[PDB]
Amino acid sequence: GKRTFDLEEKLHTNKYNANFVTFMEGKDFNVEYIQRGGLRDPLIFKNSDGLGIKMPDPDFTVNDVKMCVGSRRMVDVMDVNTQKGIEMTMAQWTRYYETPEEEREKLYNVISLEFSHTRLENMVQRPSTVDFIDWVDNMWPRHLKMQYPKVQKYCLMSVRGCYTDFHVDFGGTSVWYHIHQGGKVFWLIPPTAHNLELYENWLLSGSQGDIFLGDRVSDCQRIELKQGYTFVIPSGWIHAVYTPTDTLVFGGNFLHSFNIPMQLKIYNIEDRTRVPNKFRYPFYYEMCWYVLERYVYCITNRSHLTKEFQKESLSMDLEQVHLTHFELEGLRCLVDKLESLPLHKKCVPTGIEDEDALIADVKILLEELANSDPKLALTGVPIVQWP
Ligand SMILES: [Fe+2]
DSSP states (O other): OOSSSOHHHHHHOSOOBOOOOEEOOGGGOSHHHHHHHOSOSOEEESSOTTTTOBOOOTTOOSHHHHHHSOTTOEEOOEETTSSOOOOEEHHHHHHHHTSOTTTOOSOEEEEEEOOTTSGGGGGOBOOHHHHHHOTTTTTSOGGGOOOSOOOSOEEEEEOTTOEEEEEOOGGGOEEEEEEEEEEEEEEEEOOOHHHHHHHHHHHHTTOOSSSOHHHHSSOOEEEEEOTTOEEEEOTTOEEEEEEEEEEEEEEEEEOOSSSHHHHHHHHHHHHHTTOOTTSSOTTHHHHHHHHHHHHHHHHHOOOOBOHHHHHHHHHHHOOOOOOOHHHHHHHHHHHHHHHTSOGGGOOOOSSBSOHHHHHHHHHHHHHHTSSOOHHHHOOSSOSOOOO
């Protein structure tokens, strides 16, 4: 939007004083933290230290991006004055970023450039903790990485003045954010049963653009991200973003096993809200089956993939257990969800032999481990390791 309500007011009134964001040191961001909290709090690290992140040399610019992914390359740009207008490439767009503000004709924003394809990849690496819990590196069969939700690394490039209205990222994913150059202002809203309600009825009634959802909730936090900060958003959070100055950001969306109920909670919103099967998370329910099969294999040492995939996994490798309540309830959710899908679209992936045997093997594993000691679960390392 930015239509009816004064965004300018929303930016300076000092009233979105909620205290949701937790400030901490990257060293403190280990897997145990996740098992202890379930990545339920948005995090803001000021020093990239301790996070195991790697980013280009600070002077890196927009074209240094468009050189790498090269010009003539089509990019999904959109005029933040309505929607969609992806009629341009890196060539045509770096020629816009450097266009002095006043001359600047339209208002553009590029929030969806996922470069993992391009060389830039081994030039930009996310915090190692995220490499431990990510459902792609650790869940999806390795030899397949389209056929692997290529939605890990992203390059955000915004121009002073753009505003992305309130939304919850796709597939109930979490997201890490590193402002390389510039700054961003966020409006954080918690995925309270109540807020998620208001949020859906808002997506239905039209997202009016006349209502600033931030004012609709009892408490909301407007935070400011500076150059150097790393920002972690947990699944489900409803946020809105505004760019005070031309910025360059590097981040990515991931799924993990400690907040499954919320992730699914969001898919169903995306379902009821008839979201276009375009912006849907790639192979969602298919990733789910691999999740179960990894859990049942890492714990029961009973493989449920096919012989073929089993060989592939073994070849590549050669080149009791106490769960948190988070995973236990989460597994319970994947099981009920998958079981409630009409037979035709249960989206059983390709590497899985018998599905029902799996589900049965999980209902059994979910009852045997029903009593896990929260203390003992805190192993410091995810049980699903070695994709
Ligand atoms: Fe977002």
